[PDB]
Amino acid sequence: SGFRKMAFPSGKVEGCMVQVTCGTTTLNGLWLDDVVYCPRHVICTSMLNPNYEDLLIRKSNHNFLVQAGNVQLRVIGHSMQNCVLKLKVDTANPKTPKYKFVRIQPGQTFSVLACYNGSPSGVYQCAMRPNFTIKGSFLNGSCGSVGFNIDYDCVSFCYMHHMELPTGVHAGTDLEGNFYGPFVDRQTAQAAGTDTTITVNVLAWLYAAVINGDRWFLNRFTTTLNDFNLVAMKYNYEPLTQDHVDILGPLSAQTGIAVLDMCASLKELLQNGMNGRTILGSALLEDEFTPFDVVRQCSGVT
Amino acid sequence: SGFRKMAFPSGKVEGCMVQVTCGTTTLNGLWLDDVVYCPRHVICTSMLNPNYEDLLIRKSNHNFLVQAGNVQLRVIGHSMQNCVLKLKVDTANPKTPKYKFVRIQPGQTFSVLACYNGSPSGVYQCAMRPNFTIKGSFLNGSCGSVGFNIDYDCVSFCYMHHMELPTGVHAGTDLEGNFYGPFVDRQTAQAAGTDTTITVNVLAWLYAAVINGDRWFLNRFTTTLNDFNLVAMKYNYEPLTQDHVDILGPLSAQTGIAVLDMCASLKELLQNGMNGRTILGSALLEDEFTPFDVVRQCSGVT
Numbered sequence: 001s002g003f004r005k006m007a008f009p010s011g012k013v014e015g016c017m018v019q020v021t022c023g024t025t026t027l028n029g030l031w032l033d034d035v036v037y038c039p040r041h042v043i044c045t046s047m048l049n050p051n052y053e054d055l056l057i058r059k060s061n062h063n064f065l066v067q068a069g070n071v072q073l074r075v076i077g078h079s080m081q082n083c084v085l086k087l088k089v090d091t092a093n094p095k096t097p098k099y100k101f102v103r104i105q106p107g108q109t110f111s112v113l114a115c116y117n118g119s120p121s122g123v124y125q126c127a128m129r130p131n132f133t134i135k136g137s138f139l140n141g142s143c144g145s146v147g148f149n150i151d152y153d154c155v156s157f158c159y160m161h162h163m164e165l166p167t168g169v170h171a172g173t174d175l176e177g178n179f180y181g182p183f184v185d186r187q188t189a190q191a192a193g194t195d196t197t198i199t200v201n202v203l204a205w206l207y208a209a210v211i212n213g214d215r216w217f218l219n220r221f222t223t224t225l226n227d228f229n230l231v232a233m234k235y236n237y238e239p240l241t242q243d244h245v246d247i248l249g250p251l252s253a254q255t256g257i258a259v260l261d262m263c264a265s266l267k268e269l270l271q272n273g274m275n276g277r278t279i280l281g282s283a284l285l286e287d288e289f290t291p292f293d294v295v296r297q298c299s300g301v302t
Numbered sequence: 303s304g305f306r307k308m309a310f311p312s313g314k315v316e317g318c319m320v321q322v323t324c325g326t327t328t329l330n331g332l333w334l335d336d337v338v339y340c341p342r343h344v345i346c347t348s349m350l351n352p353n354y355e356d357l358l359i360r361k362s363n364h365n366f367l368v369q370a371g372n373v374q375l376r377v378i379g380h381s382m383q384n385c386v387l388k389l390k391v392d393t394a395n396p397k398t399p400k401y402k403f404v405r406i407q408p409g410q411t412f413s414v415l416a417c418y419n420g421s422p423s424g425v426y427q428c429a430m431r432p433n434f435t436i437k438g439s440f441l442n443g444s445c446g447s448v449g450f451n452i453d454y455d456c457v458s459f460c461y462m463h464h465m466e467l468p469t470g471v472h473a474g475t476d477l478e479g480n481f482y483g484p485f486v487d488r489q490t491a492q493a494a495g496t497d498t499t500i501t502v503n504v505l506a507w508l509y510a511a512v513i514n515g516d517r518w519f520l521n522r523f524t525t526t527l528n529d530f531n532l533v534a535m536k537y538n539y540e541p542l543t544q545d546h547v548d549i550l551g552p553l554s555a556q557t558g559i560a561v562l563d564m565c566a567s568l569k570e571l572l573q574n575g576m577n578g579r580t581i582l583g584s585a586l587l588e589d590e591f592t593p594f595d596v597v598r599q600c601s602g603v604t
């Protein structure tokens with residue numbers, strides 16, 4: 001029993017975190033096999049409209065100081081891939097896990113290993129919001145921290161941290177260096193666009209709550225998908241699709257509550273609020289747990 | 303910016319997790335140097351009033367199967383220490399970190415590495431509640447999962463998981479095998495006692511919110527410690543002491559808001575509610591972040 005924001009164990013990623021320094025800029029890099037990946041912003045200096053192709057042509061291998069704990073790694077090649085740099089080093093990381101570089105969808109979750117000066121500091125769960133930002137926790141020095149999921153000892157890296165936007169939310173790239181969302185690694189007035197609530201995730205979390213014994217929000221009503229989606233639009237929730245209904249199939253069967261029956265509960269919660277009650281220790285409707293997250297953590301017993 | 307429930311990186315603990323099997327019971331153990339620590343419940347069978355001294359006298363070393371990944375560890379000694387067992391093995395764990403066994407106080411937080419069959423599954427933050435339970439997330443097979451904090455590469459182990467109580471909350475021991483709270487490792491009608499809210503933690507989290515730009519709950523008023531404590535009693539909050547005020551000193555100085563000024567905000571929130579607003583993404587007053595947790599995660603800039 002219980003339900004927590006639960007990250008994947010971070011050990012496989014900790015053994016890949018290094019420090020990259022170019023001039024007076026220090027940030028984090030990811031060392032896999034004989035390559036270190038880091039944000040190309042490490043080659044910036046005193047910001048408005050940098051030409052990174054020029055900045056990189058002017059660098060030499062010896063300009064990049066890479067430190068893995070107390071060992072310096074000799075850089076033997078450098079190249080740019082979109083908004084990341086690839087620093088080839090003379091030593092393969094003996095701790096490299098099985099890994100993949102995946103790009104995630106908005107509404108999916110991942111674990112973040114926040115690092116500073118190449119040293120891991122903390123681990124937490126994040127979701128990619130519909131507007132392609134993440135609500136992270138990052139301070140100065142966090143550039144190059146990574147996001148990931150783990151499946152049967154394979155690490156799927158999905159996020160490298162770059163910047164903080166004016167509202168305090170965060171933006172970054174996949175490990176191919178392509179930004180999530182309409183953001184750029186330079187100084188502009190860019191801001192997060194309007195966001196929405198991830199409906200399928202809210203429904204998954206109501207299922208988690210039922211599995212854990214919170215039932216007060218259930219009711220005898222069932223709604224249609226079309227009628228529910230009319231309510232979702234009013235409250236800035238994303239539309240629910242039949243694929244979403246299908247994905248919720250296992251949790252629906254385990255609790256015996258049809259997906260469209262739970263939707264009638266969600267409509268009532270949106271229209272009435274909670275009237276002073278809580279669900280899984282929260283007084284708001286939580287949207288940062290996917291159906292997979294609920295299945296991973298919650299009992300399987302039907 | 304940002305504020306998340308952030309665990310310590312779990313790698314140093316993952317390398318210590320093993321599987322202990324005695325008969326048809328399997329659970330987790332912690333392998334440090336040449337000793338494996340696990341709940342003594344592993345020697346139970348088909349529960350009401352076990353005499354563990356008798357159960358252990360009837361065991362031999364060969365009855366305990368210890369597996370570290372795909373390597374079996376040969377047990378060469380066994381002994382009981384309160385509610386844990388100490389299984390001496392013929393091999394020191396080459397991955398043992400610097401460590402200490404500490405016992406924590408109610409109101410303090412730690413990270414939990416949830417494990418199953420000796421394999422780590424997830425990591426999350428927990429607080430020891432005033433009634434000595436934890437609100438964890440654990441399924442069958444989780445016995446022997448551990449709680450810990452990390453400080454300059456030293457792991458302070460503070461919790462080993464034993465059981466789930468009827469309300470779904472959890473109880474366990476320190477690594478000396480002494481239970482937190484009035485609980486026992488046998489079948490009884492034991493239940494969690496009445497709980498309270500951890501006032502100093504709520505104040506720390508309001509400071510986190512100020513540091514992160516949420517200011518709507520601030521006001522021009524200051525209260526006395528005695529008058530605040532009258533309000534705390536009414537709302538089932540713990541009393542605030544001068545030591546608590548002192549501990550909040552650094553956060554008070556960083557934000558420029560005196561502790562007793564913030565207390566006037568907390569009184570108003572308790573008496574009026576939030577009127578539809580949120581603080582750090584929550585619609586309730588959060589009490590599972592200590593002042594140390596806030597300092598660890600939040601900007602230091604005054």
Ligand SMILES: *C(=O)c1ccc2[nH]ccc2c1
Pocket residue numbers: 027039041042143144161162163184185186187
């Ligand atoms: C770190 O990767 C970083 C710092 C500041 C920035 N501004 C635009 C992109 C970045 C990246």
Ligand SMILES: *C(=O)c1ccc2[nH]ccc2c1
Pocket residue numbers: 329341343344445446463464465486487488489
């Ligand atoms: C596991 O350590 C465990 C399972 C069930 C129990 N009942 C009382 C104590 C325990 C411990």
